[PDB]
Amino acid sequence: GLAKWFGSDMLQQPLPSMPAKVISVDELEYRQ
Amino acid sequence: GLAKWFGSDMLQQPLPSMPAKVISVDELEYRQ
Amino acid sequence: TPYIGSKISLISKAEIRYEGILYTIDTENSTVALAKVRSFGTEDRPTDRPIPPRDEVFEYIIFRGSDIKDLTVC
Amino acid sequence: TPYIGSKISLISKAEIRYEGILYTIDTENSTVALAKVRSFGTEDRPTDRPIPPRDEVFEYIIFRGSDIKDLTVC
């Protein structure tokens, strides 16, 4: 899916961990 | 404002820094 | 009285109750960060839009003071 | 070809263009994290909901692959 934009070698090597998902109570209550 | 819920001493002493605000493109485009 | 790292029970103005660890506070923006938070829903608080407990555990949830109906330590 | 820390120009499916630093990727959820991001709006891409450049700088913006109309290095 992401291969459309990123090289094959990049999808393979170790990547930095995603930043912590920080959500606001507004979005949490508004969506679900 | 927050004094309604937290002690006076706590609002004074040094606090840990807020986690980085991580937003999704969904929310960013949906709101503004 | 609450402190950094204490277990917080927090009822929002939508009558939804949250349990999480008090991570920190931002006095400038009047915001509150809880960690490892779970939503308990509306429980026994009357409302025409009831919410049941959700299983999911949230890494961080940020509340404004104006979102808070009530806040107590556990 | 893009790499960690490269400058990315990213047009969403709403024709809005973003510039930010490629922070990392999550291959499992097909999501992409940009850092120090700015919104350039719809610019010259036709649309009945035009958006002008916004000044604000975002700490992190998370895109799904399905949000991406186009992605190029600068």
Number of structural domains found in chain B: 1
Domains and CATH numbers, chain D: 1-74 (2.30.30.100)
Q: In this complex, do C24 and B18 lie within 8 Å of one another by their Cβ atoms?
A: yes
D touches B (3+ CB pairs < 8 Å)? yes
Rounded to 10 degrees, what is the CA torsion of C52, A30, A25, A17?
100
DSSP states along C10-64: EEETTS-EEEEEEEEEETTTTEEEEEEEEEEESTTS--SS-------EEEEEEEE
In which domain, by residue range, is B15 found? 2-31
**What DSSP assignment string belongs to chain B?**
-GGGTS-HHHHHS--PPPPP-EEEHHHHHHH-
Q: Which helix (H) or strand (E) holds A31?
A: helix A25-31
Listed residue (B24, A12, A4) closest to D65, CA to CA: A4
| Experimentally determined by | X-ray
Which of chain C's residues have a Cβ under 8 Å away from the Cβ of B1?
30, 65-66
What is the DSSP secondary structure assignment for residue C4, as one 8-state letter? T
Chain A residues whose beta carbon lies within 8 Å of the beta carbon of residue B20 = 19-20, 22
CB pairs under 8 A between A and B: 11
* Cβ count within 10 A of residue B1: 11
**CA Rg value for chain D:** 12
C-alpha separations of D27 from A10, A14, C58, D57 in Å: 10, 11, 21, 26
**Tokens 């400038």 sit on residue:** C28
